[PDB]
């Protein structure tokens, strides 16, 4: 769940990759199913939306039993897991996943060639902003990171809802394409980490579950301020929490070699400089030709 100990239970079940993938909350029927689940579990709706700290302590104590009793029915039996929790005296607890999410949020949204340099240097500064937060004397940075993580998750959820509702994910025998060209949150999708967050969100929902074949997904986002696409080549994933022989074998990501070959053949000023080869930057006028070349490559 997403920031269970720093938000409301309803929000924890709402802004979650696995929960949404299992229940497909992006449509109204998913929200109705979630409401029915909460009603069956016995937790009221007003109580479920109260912050974790101020929520009634009885339900907080009995939560594990409630989850065990009433989650098999809705298929969310893989939600339960064992994780590390670190708490300092008289201060609220925090789990490893929440700490990592806060650190990533601080890295992402915390705070011609000139714009590129400014963006990269802002990311470098955010690196140090995150570095300090990793200490026990800088709890304020941790709280700010948690708030920023909440905001980023809300924005990514909204964008994913829009994409899924409008059915922008075209399907091809080899790969799947999702190109963004408008929206209110397109500014955020310039940091590779945020774009990868959106990619993971989309991969979990209907690309790894819902009886769908596993194909690499190419996700791109425009930025009119520089006229280029932050194309990212993501790898598929097997259903979460399903141990099997095929699950043991890692799913290799073949985007790097095909990307390099296509860049070598053509000339579109592709910026292959990120350490992760999955991400490049292609000019606006040369996106569709590059996609056609990738389709013809047959190397994915």
């Amino acid at each position: 769940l997403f920031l269970l100990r720093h938000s409301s239970l309803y929000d924890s079940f709402y802004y979650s990759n696995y929960v949404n993938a299992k229940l497909s909350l992006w449509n109204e029927n998913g929200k109705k199913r979630l409401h029915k689940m909460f009603a069956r579990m016995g937790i009221p709706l007003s109580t479920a939306q109260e912050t974790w700290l101020y929520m009634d302590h009885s339900i907080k104590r009995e939560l594990g039993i409630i989850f065990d009793k009433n989650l098999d029915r809705y298929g969310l039996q893989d939600i339960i897991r064992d994780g590390f929790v670190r708490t300092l005296g008289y201060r609220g607890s925090i789990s490893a996943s929440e700490f990592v999410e806060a650190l990533t949020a601080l890295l992402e949204v915390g705070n011609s060639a000139q714009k590129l340099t400014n963006l990269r240097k802002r990311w470098v500064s955010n690196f140090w902003l995150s570095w300090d937060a990793l200490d026990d004397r800088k709890v304020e940075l941790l709280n700010r990171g948690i708030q920023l993580a909440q905001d980023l998750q809300r924005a990514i959820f909204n964008t994913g809802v829009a994409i899924l509702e409008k059915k922008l994910i075209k399907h091809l025998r080899i790969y799947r394409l999702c190109v963004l060209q408008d929206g209110p949150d397109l500014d955020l999708y310039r940091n590779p980490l945020t774009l990868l967050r959106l990619g993971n969100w989309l991969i979990e929902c209907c690309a790894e579950s819902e009886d769908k074949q596993l194909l690499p997904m190419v996700l791109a986002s425009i930025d009119e301020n520089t006229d280029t696409y932050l194309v990212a080549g993501l790898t598929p994933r097997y259903p979460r929490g399903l141990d099997t022989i095929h699950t043991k074998k890692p799913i290799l990501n073949n985007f790097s070699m095909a990307f390099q070959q296509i860049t070598a053949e053509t000339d579109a000023k592709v910026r292959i400089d990120n350490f992760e080869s999955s991400i490049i930057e292609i000019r606006r006028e040369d996106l569709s030709p590059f996609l056609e070349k990738l389709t013809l490559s047959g190397l994915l």
Binding site: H35, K36, A39, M41, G42, P44
Partner: protein, 655 residues
């Protein structure tokens, strides 16, 4: 075996052995039999498709954390007639048993639902027998009755004790729990612990409360026989029913008609008369539930229709088809009905989205009828006549709350029509003060009130459509609009589209008008399943005069005003800038009101409304040019003939 645990059969319930129905129902064995039968009905009732209606109803009830399970009376009557008869004759005890059975059934689906709510009230929806406030007599006391009326009063929401616990003053003993009837207060005249007739008091700070509200239901003016006084009663709304209706609504109330002893009435009238009030059990508004409501299936139809190339023309034509001419009126009024997109800029600049239309012309021109039509078509509309209106009734009125005895404040005509339309007929006849009362709502979009120390500001964001006839009884085409109507320059400026109507004489036009009017009269003669056949013929005629059915259009207006907010992405500003410059260049002539920027704002508003017709969030060029045409024609027609010739000559591309 315990005798108290034995249960009768279904037939034996019909055979009543007791003085009254309540005594029969209250018996243990009969109570258990009734509970079993009600549970069976809830758990085994199926419709034509065979779906268990009440299982899905209970699931939905649990989904929303609601404490009300609506039950259809017809289903109960069809399944178990005797139980329906008992519920009709003795509502209180049957409803208590039904509430217990419904709480068991709900717990069947959601085992832990008791934590969320401990009581699930059962509400009867469709009582076959409908009464009126005039025909209620003593025979209806303590029975379920369905009445129709209009709400004319309402009080605030207060908590009322649900279980009380008294105490003594001589010995200090504390009495047990009781149930507090909504109509009469609990009275104790003798103790049980000290067994003395001494005074008492309310104690036991631990108590469970419930919401309580009271409204005054009055008979519908139309239903009242010719010129008779309307009859009113007081309705009590308990928890889960408060704030379900507001003054000025037509509602149907199903509840228990109870009575109680009132000393004041006996002292006043001089005879042993008892006060009466209705304890509400369900409230509904007064086909189905609401035409404006639409479904997911219908939303797909609207998108298909909007794809039509000339949908805008069909919408304009389908508006007031019974009226032959006055296409400019139809365009303006349709634009007003569709409305605009209000805009705010960083909380520093506010732009109104409403569109105001002033209708002016010769006496017989189909002016009031169009306003009457748009009254029906509009979602929330209020109709007021110039003669029969006042500022106090247009802003608000102050009342005294019978419970708290603190002065409250009513809603006015403009307030009641917020986010809607405020139609005014015979506008020129209104007095100066009332005409000033509307200046604020026209532009400020808010009404300020200061009465009885209740200083506050109210929200009034509504479009105004006004109809009037020119001063002197006719429009002298030679003179300008200034002298023709007595309205002052400000209010005249505030109007966006000014569709002046002119009644001239022409042989061909009069022939066409006569033919259309006579055909309309003959078509609507009263003489010219059975209900389905009637609907089919009505649809035949409706399509005869309307390319689009009225029913679809009514929902179309609501859907467009709700879900679509068109915005101007990019468009050649220079076109409208050039039109504005030319308007100012040609408006310098004496006798023509200067073309202020208010016309430019109106152009944009009409463009947004026109784009709303297609359900397109991109304001294309065609809509902007059409809005330019509308505004230019509206301005040109208002001027004198001498200036009209030059204005028509100069403006050719736009018109």
């Amino acid at each position: 075996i315990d005798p108290l645990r034995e249960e009768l059969t279904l037939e034996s319930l019909s055979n009543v052995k007791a003085n009254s129905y309540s005594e029969w129902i209250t018996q243990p064995n009969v109570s258990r039999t009734i509970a079993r039968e009600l549970k069976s009905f809830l758990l085994e009732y199926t419709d034509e498709t065979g779906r268990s209606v009440y299982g899905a109803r209970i699931r939905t009830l649990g989904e929303m954390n609601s404490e009300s399970l609506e039950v259809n009376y017809r289903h109960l009557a069809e399944s178990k007639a005797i139980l329906a008869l008992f519920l009709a004759k003795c509502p209180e005890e049957m409803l208590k048993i039904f509430d217990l059975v419904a709480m068991e059934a709900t717990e069947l689906h959601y085992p832990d639902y008791a934590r969320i709510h401990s009581e699930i009230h059962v509400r009867i929806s469709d009582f076959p027998t409908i009464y009126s406030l005039r025909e209620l007599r003593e025979s209806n006391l303590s029975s379920l009755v369905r009445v129709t009326g209009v709400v004319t009063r309402r009080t605030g929401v207060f908590p009322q004790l649900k279980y009380v616990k008294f105490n003594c003053l001589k010995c200090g003993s504390i009495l047990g729990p009781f149930f507090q009837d909504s109509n009469e207060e609990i009275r104790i005249s003798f103790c049980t612990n000290c067994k003395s007739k001494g005074p008492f008091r309310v104690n036991g700070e631990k108590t469970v409360y419930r919401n309580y509200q009271r409204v005054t239901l009055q008979e519908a003016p139309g239903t009242v026989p010719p010129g008779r006084l309307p009859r009113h009663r007081e309705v009590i709304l308990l928890a889960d029913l408060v704030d379900v209706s507001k003054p000025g609504e037509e509602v149907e109330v199903t509840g228990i008609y109870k009575n109680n002893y009132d000393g004041n009435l006996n002292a006043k009238n001089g005879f042993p008369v008892f006060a009466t009030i209705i304890e509400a059990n369900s409230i509904k508004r007064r086909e189905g539930l609401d035409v404006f409501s639409w479904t997911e299936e219908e939303e797909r139809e609207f998108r298909k229709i909007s794809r039509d190339r000339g949908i805008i023309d069909k919408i304009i034509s389908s508006m007031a088809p019974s009226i032959y001419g006055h296409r400019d009126i139809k365009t303006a009024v349709a634009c007003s009905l569709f409305g605009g997109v209000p805009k705010n800029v960083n909380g520093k600049h506010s732009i109104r989205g409403d569109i105001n239309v002033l209708l002016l012309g010769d006496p017989g021109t189909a002016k009031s009828q169009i306003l009457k039509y748009v009254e029906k078509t509009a979602h929330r509309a209020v109709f007021a006549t110039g003669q029969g209106a006042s500022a106090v009734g247009l802003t608000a009125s102050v009342r005294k709350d019978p419970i708290t005895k603190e002065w409250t404040l009513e809603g006015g005509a403009l307030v009641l029509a917020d986010k809607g339309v405020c139609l005014i007929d015979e506008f020129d006849k209104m007095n100066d003060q009332d005409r000033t009362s509307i200046h604020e709502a026209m532009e400020q979009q808010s009404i300020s009130i200061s009465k009885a120390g209740i200083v506050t500001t109210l929200q009034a964001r509504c479009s105004i459509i006004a109809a009037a006839n020119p001063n002197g009884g006719r429009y002298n085409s030679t003179l300008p609009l200034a002298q023709n109507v007595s309205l002052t320059e400000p209010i005249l400026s505030r109007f966006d589209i000014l569709c002046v109507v002119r009644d001239l004489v022409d042989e061909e036009a009069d022939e066409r008008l006569a033919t259309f009017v006579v055909d309309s009269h003959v078509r609507s003669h009263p003489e010219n399943n059975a209900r389905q056949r009637r609907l089919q013929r009505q649809r035949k005629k409706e399509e005869e005069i309307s390319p689009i059915p009225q029913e679809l259009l009514m929902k179309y207006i609501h859907y467009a005003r709700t879900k679509i907010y068109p915005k101007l992405h990019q468009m050649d500003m220079d076109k409208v800038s050039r039109v504005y410059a030319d308007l100012r260049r040609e408006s310098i002539s004496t006798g023509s009101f200067p073309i202020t920027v208010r016309h430019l704002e109106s152009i944009l508003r009409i463009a947004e409304s026109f784009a709303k017709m297609r359900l397109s969030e991109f304001v294309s060029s065609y809509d902007l040019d059409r809005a330019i045409k509308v505004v230019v024609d509206s301005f040109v027609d208002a001027q004198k003939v001498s200036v009209r010739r030059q204005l028509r000559r100069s403006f050719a591309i736009y018109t």
